[PDB]
Structure 1
Amino acid sequence: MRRYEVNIVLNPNLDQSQLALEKEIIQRALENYGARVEKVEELGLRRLAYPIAKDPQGYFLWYQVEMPEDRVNDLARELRIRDNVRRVMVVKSQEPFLANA
């Protein structure tokens, strides 16, 4: 099992209850696939460079997990299913490449 980063962007017009609903299904998914959660980040809403799904804003997440490589792609399918889920991207972890430091 290797470390990954799970960017996820959902509908920004979610009600705390509708929203809470998503973060839930996500947690299941992650779990169901072996996504051992190492830490999250609730950035919230930010100005997208371009409208996504007609919507001019977006609600970002970020779960750095440690799951089995052999799943990741399937996990990624599962995550995407959710309609209020706008975009999902799972980079592999990477020692930060400094610069001008």
Structure 2
Amino acid sequence: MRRYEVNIVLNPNLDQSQLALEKEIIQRALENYGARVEKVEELGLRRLAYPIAKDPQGYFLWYQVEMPEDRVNDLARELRIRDNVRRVMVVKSQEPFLANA
């Protein structure tokens, strides 16, 4: 049971129904691996620094969660099956290291 952060960049050209379906599958997959969500920050469509999947923009989602470690990798794979999902990065949570304080 460790605390992680999930960054999900998906297709910005999805309508509200397709986006709702993708987020539904994301939530269902999080429940299927026992990932208790603590907070969420939906930033949405943002301008990429380089084209990803031939698209200059991407829809960003972020989830701070807590889940068993042994299946973390096994969860990331499950999130890469959807073609609309194009970037999945899970990072162990870390305390902020402030500079120029």
TM-score bracket, shorter-length normalisation: over 0.9
> Following the alignment from structure 2 to structure 1, what is the Cα–Cα distance between the partners of residues 63 and 79?
12
> Following the alignment from structure 2 to structure 1, what is the Cα–Cα distance between the partners of residues 71 and 64?
15
1:44 to partner: Cα distance: 0.7
Deviation beyond 4 Å, 4+ runs, structure 1: none
CA displacement 1:3-38 (0-9 Å, x = unmatched): 000000000000000000000000000110011111
- The count of aligned residue pairs is 101
Q: Which TM-score applies when normalising by structure 1?
A: 0.98
SS in 1 for 2:99: coil
The runs of 5 or more residues in structure 2 that have no matched partner are: none
The runs of 5 or more residues in structure 1 that have no matched partner are: none
1:94 to partner: Cα distance: 0.2
| Structure with a larger share of its residues in strand | 2
Q: Which TM-score applies when normalising by structure 2?
A: 0.98
- The percent of aligned pairs where both chains have the same amino acid is 100
Per the alignment, residue 53 of structure 1 pairs with 53
SS in 1 for 2:27: helix
1:54 to partner: Cα distance: 0.4
> Following the alignment from structure 2 to structure 1, what is the Cα–Cα distance between the partners of residues 74 and 81?
11
Aligned-residue CA RMSD (Å): 0.5
